Amino acid sequence: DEQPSQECIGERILSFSELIKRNSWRYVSDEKSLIYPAYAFDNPAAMYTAADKLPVWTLTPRSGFPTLLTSIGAMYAFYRGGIRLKIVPGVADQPKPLVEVALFTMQDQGYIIKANDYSTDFCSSNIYENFVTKGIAEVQTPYYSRVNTSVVSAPVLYNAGNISPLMPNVMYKITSNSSNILLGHSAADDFRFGFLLGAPLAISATALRDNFTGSSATVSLPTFSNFYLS
């Protein structure tokens, strides 16, 4: 009976496919010009403790915090298809309001976050959006993979660089004029996950406000509130 769902909820949801098209926030940066590894789907490493005067939980992000996308992805082994990308500014810089997202493919470059150094990467796919006029930057990203089936949070290696087959060999180069910037992503239309494994390694979220050791709760997450107010 689909009555309740119509009488109370007003919607009815059937696949995570539906959910992961909702854009969630991933990571923040201070870099005007940043190299981000799009198809990084890792989550933070966690640390718990009971000892006094210590923050209970602590989180070390390798490539960002859990989006709906990654949170879900954790359950599966494989993925394919493309992704979306949303970007928010600390600063609506009236005279330099622009953002570049560009397709970044340098072969040797490593598949993890790093600030832009290259001045010599001409003639790449460049999208532009105006922070002043259109508050947020919105983007879509082709799967552009060397293979038909990629892997959830593939272990990158020191010089896996940007040519690992186990992912799309493609990154974002983001050049803004907001000091601080907030990144988020949902999956694209054609995106799909594969081979369900089980629950992923996880911990209560509501619990991250634990402070029973006296030492106050430190660990925060990339949300709008946390970003916009600094």
Partner: peptide
């Protein structure tokens, strides 16, 4: 705010 842009509920 709902996930579904359409989300409405039936006139019970």
């Amino acid at each position: 705010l709902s996930l579904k842009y359409g989300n409405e509920v039936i006139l019970k």
